[PDB]
Design a protein around this ligand. Structure first.
Ligand code: AMP
Length: 453
């Protein structure tokens, strides 16, 4: 319980919240779709490969197409006027809080943090009910900034962003025409739209003036959702407009002294990914990422040779070298890299924390990650004891010894490098958003130990 000095942490979170409505597909389900829509019409439609869903058949064909590959896919609805028709035709099994803000803010509430301020542009009644009741939502009433609970700041008439997810296990089998189909791998087919018509990824004009005020009452922030920003919008606005104003929010928050953290998401649009590199990464204090994304960042900065060595081979010496480049280039205090086997932490030599403390930050991150992996969602702090029963990966212990040897050889260590093995869960319940869980655990723990000093 001593580690839980974190409960003394207050934190601000923006920008992405949504509702996840999940269907857990079984063979019978796909069978009913085949019967109700027909085999030839689906087969013909799969050849068509619609890029957006306009008629119910589009969804049937793209869902089956994806199931054939075992690879992930996202197709938006053609128009938000089809939402309620879609939800009555293809009903969900369960509804849930989605989005990096909504998921992590709810977890930080369950971890009893001092103050957790979460912000999203849309706050419909159904959405606001998904929040943990301890969360605070910023509001400007009567020329003053007021933190109120979400079930008391919601607005009727507000739309609701919903991600429709269809989960299919490995090996789900069904016939289509003569083609017998087997799921090569477990994957999820997602029906969802990036915001344009209904909302945008930004702090509204009214709240902007109060960002520095939010900066005073908060020890740290975690910002996310930049993968939802579009290159061009119909109203003539562009990614640059929103990325510029996203840069402004970080700068307004940092008039006062806070740490800002970013978890580097897997943005498949390279032009929007390059925007995150240019507008967000240089202005932030902490970053977390996997092996794939550091190579993707190194490739944007021009280290093409290094990027492929990490991608092809994954040697820890190369990941450490790539993390050192990120640390020195961008005004960062720390860089975090996570893989199924290890978590790596690097900070300049003048970091107020000791190598001993940095390892404690990491230890707590592996426990929290292992709790969620074995239990699915975390619902209580008691659950962290389940993660403590998960032992360290044996190959990571080997990498720890390797890093220790590396450090002894070099003449000057102007850096603090700490690696611990992960608490791998072999037959995990869930794997989604595990990266945000680990990265948040280490960052919050890191902010704690800084605050004690
Ligand atoms: N079975 C598992 N047990 C513990 N952690 C896992 C497991 N599978 C995946 N992870 C973590 O999930 C992360 C994936 O993060 P990302 O794909 O960036 O969201 C990896 O870096 C691992 O640390």
């Amino acid at each position: 319980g001593h580690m839980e000095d974190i409960k003394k942490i207050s934190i601000f979170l923006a920008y992405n919240v949504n509702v996840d409505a999940i269907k857990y597909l079984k063979e019978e389900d796909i069978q009913k779709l085949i019967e109700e829509f027909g085999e030839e019409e689906i087969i013909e439609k799969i050849e068509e490969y619609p890029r957006k869903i306009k008629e119910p058949l589009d969804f049937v064909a793209r869902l089956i197409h994806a199931i054939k590959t075992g690879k992930p896919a996202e197709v938006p609805l053609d128009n938000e006027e089809l939402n309620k028709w879609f939800d009555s035709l293809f009903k969900y099994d369960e509804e849930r809080m989605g989005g990096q803000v909504g998921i992590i803010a709810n977890l930080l509430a369950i971890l009893d943090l001092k103050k957790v301020i979460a912000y999203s542009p849309l706050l419909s009644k159904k959405q606001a009910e998904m929040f943990n009741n301890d969360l605070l939502y910023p509001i400007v009433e009567n020329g003053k900034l007021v933190l109120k609970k979400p079930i008391e700041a919601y607005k009727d008439n507000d739309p609701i962003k919903i991600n429709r997810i269809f989960e299919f296990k490995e090996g789900i089998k069904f016939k289509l025409g003569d083609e017998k189909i087997i799921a090569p791998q477990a994957n999820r087919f997602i029906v969802a739209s990036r915001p344009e018509n209904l909302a945008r990824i930004e702090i509204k004009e009214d709240l902007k003036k109060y960002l520095p005020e939010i900066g005073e009452m908060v020890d740290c922030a975690i910002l996310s959702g930049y993968q939802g920003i579009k290159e061009k919008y119909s109203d003539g606005k562009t990614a640059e407009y929103y990325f510029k104003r996203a840069k402004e929010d970080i700068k307004l928050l940092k008039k006062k002294d806070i740490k800002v953290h970013l978890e580097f998401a897997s943005i498949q649009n390279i032009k929007i990914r390059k925007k995150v590199v240019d507008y967000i990464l240089p202005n932030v204090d902490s970053v977390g990422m996997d092996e794939t994304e550091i190579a993707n960042i190194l490739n944007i900065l021009g280290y093409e040779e290094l990027s492929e060595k990490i991608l092809k081979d994954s040697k820890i010496e190369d990941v450490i070298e790539g993390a050192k480049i990120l640390l020195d280039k961008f005004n960062l205090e720390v860089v975090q890299v996570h893989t199924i086997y290890y978590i790596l932490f690097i900070s300049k030599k003048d970091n107020p924390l000791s190598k001993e403390e940095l390892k404690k930050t990491l230890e707590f991150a592996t426990i929290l990650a292992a709790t969620k992996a074995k239990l699915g969602d975390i619902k209580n702090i008691e659950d962290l004891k389940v993660g403590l029963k998960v032992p360290h990966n044996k190959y990571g212990e080997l990498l720890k010894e390797i890093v220790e040897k590396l450090k002894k050889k070099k003449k000057k260590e102007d850096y603090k490098i700490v690696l611990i093995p992960s608490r791998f869960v072999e037959n995990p319940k869930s794997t989604v958003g595990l990266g945000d869980t680990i990265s948040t655990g280490a960052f919050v723990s890191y902010v704690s130990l800084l605050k004690k000093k």
